[PDB]
């Protein structure tokens, strides 16, 4: 067989220890899921420094906590715009998830509050900027470099799926690099607590699994498809399915005929053919052995999963950081006022926030 006695016993023990960890993690999540925290600060506790990102709902700003000097990333959502865009439930769910989860690669929610106009989520500041930036800067990641990041995503999805959370928003734009070179996941607006199937069309074209595009329902295995897309893009520098227009991307995905750069290792191509598998009875992560088909794949043979979890592995890239509050790893965005109306807006829609 592939393992002798000692190796088999060690692997078996490791796998059973994961089950034991996850059972405790779920118990802890469910306590916080049922009793969320709220209203833990106010706007005038913070100085606004710089906008780190903007989107249709709001923006994310680097802020400094006046009393302590600590820097944070504050997401500001305009209540009226959230209602207009039909994102009330996504917004409330994102906050509920962030305050209940706990994992080293999931961003921590430090404070939250609201006022007449806006909702505020004060999160850790992750100073290394987006994986997207770093990937496009150097073109492609060598396989060990890609594998270091991929391993963190595998562990994060193992954790989330144990909580019955499907993630659905993976892409390099949505992954941040911390001062130690490890990945932080921040966005939970598309996440859903799902014990079986779900149907929503959501995500980014290049990262959509075939069964999201198609009308059929789907399950947490869409996240393992998306991991395949991420690993491919990290190691190639471009994603496996692209075209000028989304409808043409979708056609390629549902064919699922994937071609690889000539520099990909055979181990990498085998892993990716098993993640980018259109047939759900064959896709790694969706079989009887679950996540262990991925974690025990040859491409991951050098990965020490516990050491990654303990953040004891030296990272391949350490961002440059010139001092507290440095934003040199982020793009520049237009700076707009933070207006707070004299009148309360959309109060009843956002009571739970």
């Amino acid at each position: 067989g592939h393992m002798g006695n000692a190796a088999a016993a060690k692997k078996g023990s490791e796998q059973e220890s994961v089950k034991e960890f996850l059972a405790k993690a779920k118990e802890e999540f469910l306590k916080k899921w049922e009793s969320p925290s709220q209203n833990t600060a106010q706007l005038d506790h913070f100085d606004r420094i710089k906008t780190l990102g903007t989107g249709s709902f709001g923006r994310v700003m680097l802020v400094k906590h006046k009393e302590t000097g600590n820097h944070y990333a504050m997401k500001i959502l305009d209540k009226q715009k959230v209602v207009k865009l039909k994102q009330i439930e996504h917004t409330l769910n994102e906050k509920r998830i962030l305050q209940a989860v706990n994992f080293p690669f999931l961003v921590k929610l430090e404070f939250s509050f609201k006022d007449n106009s806006n909702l505020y989520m004060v999160m850790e500041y992750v100073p290394g900027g987006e994986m997207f930036s770093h990937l496009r800067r150097i073109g492609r990641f060598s396989e060990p470099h890609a594998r270091f990041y991929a391993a963190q995503i595998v562990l994060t999805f193992e954790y989330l799926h144990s909580l019955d959370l499907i993630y659905r928003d993976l892409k390099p734009e949505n992954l941040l690099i911390d001062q130690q070179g490890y990945i932080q996941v921040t966005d939970f607006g598309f996440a859903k607590r799902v014990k079986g199937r779900t149907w929503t069309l959501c995500g980014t074209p290049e990262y959509l699994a075939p069964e999201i595009i198609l009308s059929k329902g789907y399950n947490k295995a869409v996240d393992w498809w998306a991991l395949g897309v991420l690993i491919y893009e990290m190691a190639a520098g471009y994603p496996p399915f692209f075209a000028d227009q989304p409808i043409q991307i979708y056609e390629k995905i549902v064919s699922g005929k994937v071609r690889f750069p000539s520099h990909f290792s055979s181990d990498l191509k085998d892993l990716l053919r098993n993640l980018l598998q259109v047939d759900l009875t064959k896709r790694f992560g969706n079989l009887k052995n679950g996540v262990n088909d991925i974690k025990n794949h040859k491409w991951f043979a050098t990965t020490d999963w516990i050491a990654i979890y303990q953040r004891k592995v030296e990272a391949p890239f350490i961002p440059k950081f010139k001092g507290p509050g440095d934003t040199s790893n982020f793009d520049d965005y237009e700076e707009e006022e933070i207006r707070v109306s004299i009148n309360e807006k959309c109060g009843k829609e956002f009571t739970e926030f």
């Binding site: 997207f132 496009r136 928003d169 892409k171 734009e173 598309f190 069309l201 959501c202 995500g203 980014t204 074209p205 290049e206 520098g237 471009y238 692209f242 075209a243 000028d244 989304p246 071609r259 750069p261």
Partner: peptide, 19 residues
Amino acid sequence: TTYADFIASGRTGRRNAIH
């Protein structure tokens, strides 16, 4: 090449979600 086709697609910058 595939990479040149990627550049020609115009989808080399940050990609938006469908909604």
